[PDB]
């Protein structure tokens, strides 16, 4: 089995990880100086968010030069040094690949917009307006229409996201070749992995017809139904990945779960791993800034479906948080002071016992929570500016209604600076951080976590050790004991005769769990919030609030 199936990944959002020059923005030197921390945690590989030249209208995801490093993060030498220091520790690097769109400051686009006959014109999507308005009714994720009129030619260019993020035209052969040459440029450096940002929106619908009112409510799904999508992915694998030894993972956003196997089935030669969002958005409204209450039943049934989708030839990633979602403990657990540590450990047990490649987002091993936003001005996220444009200036909602709701969902919840210690600005920076540090850093910080064997960090470290020492916990089969149960999450991991039982109580009350008839406890690997391990040969468990545990049966 390939190294990535048993690897434990850590996601670094460099902007908010570690600053080393007091500009308030994290950088490469900051990450490099903190590799010993990540290695000590047990991390095998790191996925870093976009590190290329960018005007930062979407914090790295608007790339103006694919072959240069972002000025804020450092120089190419700093990148090479990061690579070298990762290799010295036997750690691998996964970089972010953003080729659904570029920055509008990219030289391709500057030339593209000059004229219709320009050699780079078809590097992007240019269209005439319709009936005195946009070419069609396409909305943008980041506000308003997905079409922006350029007075230079008088046509509209396409942007699923920010207006300064024009979509690249995958239908143009020379554009694809330029992207393939770009990928080689990073893979030649020894990059071990590539994460493909919104990989399913590469193919655009011919003719650009209007979206039906039904498609309007869920436009993200319509943008994933291009007819040439898998053709392009298969070609990219042929021209690039077939000649290297890097692992590929796709941010498969907007895609209906039934279409996922088309992306990750190894026989299809497209992608190796999938980032699905059925689980992480299982309690999010279609407008993306409201929360809809769910139960553990929904939680586990969603997981069960995603697992079945992987089948025998596909492979899933697993994560409870990233740079685009609220904090895991706040989202899936209970971040209240008396339950924060207990539930964070429970969620840790879940994360590192799933069938797939687990990804740990920075800060979650500390039990970092959502930020207490007080005003809309506390948000940096362009997406929130888009919500204000679409819902507040239109009179659909008040500023207070946006604030109250978006606080629970905003991407900025996960973008507050990593909390290293209790010094000024949690040891993230000596200057003023680009985004405010959570005031709870005095109680939640790496320095206190590391020195405490009962901390969230220590539990994370121990779990990573256990998963590494237990093959079944990674590539073993997955089976939910009772998908209808909304109190206690329980499942088994089995491989080569060895069967392991995971039991996680999601209630803040005592609960009792009964093993399947014929199953008995043979050994207790680890437990959180447990006063006593079960006796050898037990057929049931008495669980404390938010108690998690791994058992061999």
Q: Identify which range of 14-22, 172-180, 197-205, 380-388 contacts Ca ion by CB under 5 A.
A: 14-22
CA angle at 279 for the pair 493 and 289, rounded to the nearest 5°: 160
> Per the annotation, where are the binding residues?
19, 21, 23, 25, 27
Query: Measured in whole angstroms, how far is the alpha carbon of residue 488 from the centre of its chain?
Result: 26
Report helix, strand or coil for 113.
coil
CB nearer Ca ion, residue 410 or residue 425: 425
Rg of the chain (C-alpha set): 23
Q: Which residues contact 431 (CB under 8 A, 6 or more apart)?
A: 19, 22, 23, 24
So which residues are the catalytic ones? 197, 251
DSSP 390: I
Q: What is the spatial distance between Cα 480 and Cα 302, in angstroms, rounded to a whole number?
A: 11
Minimum distance of Ca ion from residue 433's CB (angstroms): 10
19 binds Ca ion (CB under 5 A): yes
- Give the strand pairing for 247-251 and 273-275: parallel
Minimum distance of Ca ion from residue 77's CB (angstroms): 15
Among 5, 6, 21, 458, binds Ca ion (CB under 5 A): 21
23 binds Ca ion (CB under 5 A): yes
Q: Identify which range of 27-35, 206-214, 295-303, 523-531 contacts Ca ion by CB under 5 A.
A: 27-35
Q: Tell me the two tokens of residue 347.
A: 């969620």
487 binds Ca ion (CB under 5 A): no
78 binds Ca ion (CB under 5 A): no
25 binds Ca ion (CB under 5 A): yes
In 3D space, the residue among 370, 435, 376 whose CA is nearest the CA of residue 401 turns out to be 376
CB nearer Ca ion, residue 27 or residue 197: 27
Minimum distance of Ca ion from residue 110's CB (angstroms): 28
Measured CA to CA in angstroms, residue 319 lies from 111, 323, 545 at distances of: 40, 11, 23
CB nearer Ca ion, residue 25 or residue 350: 25
Is-contact 456 419, C-beta < 8 A? Answer: no
CB nearer Ca ion, residue 37 or residue 282: 37
In 3D space, the residue among 358, 360, 394 whose CA is nearest the CA of residue 474 turns out to be 358
Q: What is the spatial distance between Cα 395 and Cα 215, in angstroms, rounded to a whole number?
A: 23
Q: What is the spatial distance between Cα 93 and Cα 246, in angstroms, rounded to a whole number?
A: 10
Minimum distance of Ca ion from residue 427's CB (angstroms): 14
Binding footprint of Ca ion, residue count (CB under 5 A)? 5
In this chain, which residue has its C-beta nearest to Ca ion? 27
CB nearer Ca ion, residue 14 or residue 367: 14
58-74 burial: b if 16+ Cβ within 10 Å, else e: bbbbbbbebeebbebbb
Is-contact 304 485, C-beta < 8 A? Answer: no
CB nearer Ca ion, residue 17 or residue 373: 17
State the maximum Cα–Cα separation within the chain, in Å, rounded to a whole number: 77
Q: Identify which range of 15-23, 57-65, 262-270, 522-530 contacts Ca ion by CB under 5 A.
A: 15-23
Minimum distance of Ca ion from residue 25's CB (angstroms): 5
Is-contact 22 30, C-beta < 8 A? Answer: no
CB nearer Ca ion, residue 59 or residue 203: 59
> Per the annotation, where are the binding residues for Ca(2+)?
19, 21, 23, 25, 27
- Give the strand pairing for 126-127 and 155-158: antiparallel
Q: Identify which range of 23-31, 292-300, 371-379, 458-466 contacts Ca ion by CB under 5 A.
A: 23-31
Minimum distance of Ca ion from residue 73's CB (angstroms): 8
Is-contact 6 475, C-beta < 8 A? Answer: yes
Based on the number of CB atoms within 10 Å of its own CB, is 372 exposed (0-12), middle (13-18) or buried (19 or more)? exposed
Is-contact 10 45, C-beta < 8 A? Answer: yes
Minimum distance of Ca ion from residue 548's CB (angstroms): 37
DSSP annotation string for 135-195: SS-PBPTTSSBSEEEETTTTEEEE-SS-TTSPBB-TTSHHHHHHHHHHHHHHHTTT--EEE
Among 11, 18, 27, 43, binds Ca ion (CB under 5 A): 27
Minimum distance of Ca ion from residue 328's CB (angstroms): 26
367-406: which residues touch Ca ion (CB under 5 A)?
none
Q: What is the spatial distance between Cα 123 and Cα 291, in angstroms, rounded to a whole number?
A: 38
Q: Identify which range of 17-25, 147-155, 326-334, 395-403 contacts Ca ion by CB under 5 A.
A: 17-25
CB nearer Ca ion, residue 29 or residue 130: 29
Beta partners for residue 357, in sequence order: 317
CB nearer Ca ion, residue 21 or residue 215: 21
Residues lying near Ca ion in the complex (CB under 5 A): 19, 21, 23, 25, 27
């Amino acid at each position: 089995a390939p190294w990535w199936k048993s690897a434990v990944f850590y996601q670094v959002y460099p902007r908010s990880f570690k600053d080393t020059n007091g500009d308030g923005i994290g950088d490469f030197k900051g990450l490099t100086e903190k590799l010993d921390y990540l290695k000590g945690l047990g991390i095998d590989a790191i996925w870093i968010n976009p590190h290329y030249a960018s005007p930062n209208t979407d914090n790295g995801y608007d790339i103006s030069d694919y072959r240069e490093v972002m000025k804020e993060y450092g120089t190419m030498e700093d990148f090479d040094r990061l690579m070298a220091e990762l290799k010295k520790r036997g750690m691998r690097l996964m970089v972010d690949v953003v080729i659904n769109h570029s920055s509008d400051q990219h030289e391709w686009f500057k030339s593209s917009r000059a004229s219709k006959d320009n050699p780079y014109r078809d590097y992007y999507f240019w269209r005439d307006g319709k009936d005195g308005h946009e070419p069609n009714n396409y909305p943008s994720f980041f506000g308003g229409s997905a079409w922006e009129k350029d007075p230079v030619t008088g046509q509209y260019y396409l942007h699923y996201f920010g207006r300064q993020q024009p979509d690249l035209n995958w239908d143009t052969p020379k554009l694809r070749e330029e992207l393939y040459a770009m990928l080689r440029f990073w893979l030649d450096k020894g990059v071990s992995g590539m994460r493909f940002d919104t990989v399913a929106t590469y193919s655009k619908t011919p003719g650009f017809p209007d979206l039906t009112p039904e498609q309007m409510k869920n436009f993200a799904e319509a943008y994933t139904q291009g007819p040439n999508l898998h053709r392009y992915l298969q070609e990219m694998h042929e021209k690039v990945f077939d000649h290297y030894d890097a692992v590929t993972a796709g941010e498969i956003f907007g895609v209906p779960l039934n279409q996922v196997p088309l992306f990750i089935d190894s026989r299809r030669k497209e992608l190796d791993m999938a980032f699905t969002f059925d689980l992480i958005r299982y309690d999010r409204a279609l407008d993306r800034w409201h929360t809809i209450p769910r139960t553990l039943a929904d939680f586990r049934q969603t997981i069960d479906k995603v697992d079945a989708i992987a089948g025998e030839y596909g492979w899933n990633t697993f994560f409870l948080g990233n740079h685009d979602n609220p904090r895991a403990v706040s989202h899936f657990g209970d971040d209240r002071p008396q339950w924060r540590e207990a539930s964070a450990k429970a969620l840790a047990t879940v994360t590192l016992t799933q069938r797939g490649t687990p990804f740990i987002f920075q800060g979650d091993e500390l039990g970092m929570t959502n930020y207490p936003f007080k005003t809309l001005q506390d948000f940096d996220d362009i997406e929130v500016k888009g919500f204000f444009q679409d819902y507040v200036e239109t009179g659909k909602a008040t500023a207070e209604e946006l604030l109250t709701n978006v606080a629970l969902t905003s991407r900025d919840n996960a973008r507050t600076p990593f909390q290293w210690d209790d010094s000024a600005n949690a040891g993230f920076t000596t200057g003023k951080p680009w985004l405010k540090v959570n005031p709870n850093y005095t109680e939640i910080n790496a320095a206190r976590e590391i020195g405490d064997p009962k901390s969230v960090y220590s539990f994370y470290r121990n779990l990573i050790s256990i998963r590494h020492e237990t093959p079944a916990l990674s590539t073993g089969s997955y089976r939910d004991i009772d998908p209808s149960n909304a109190d206690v999450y329980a499942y088994t991991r089995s491989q080569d005769g060895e069967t392991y039982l995971v039991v996680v109580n999601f209630k803040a009350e005592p609960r009792s769990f009964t093993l399947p008839d014929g199953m008995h406890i043979a050994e207790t690997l680890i437990e959180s919030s447990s006063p006593a391990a079960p006796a050898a040969g037990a057929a049931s468990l008495e669980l404390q609030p938010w108690q998690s545990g791994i058992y061999k049966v």
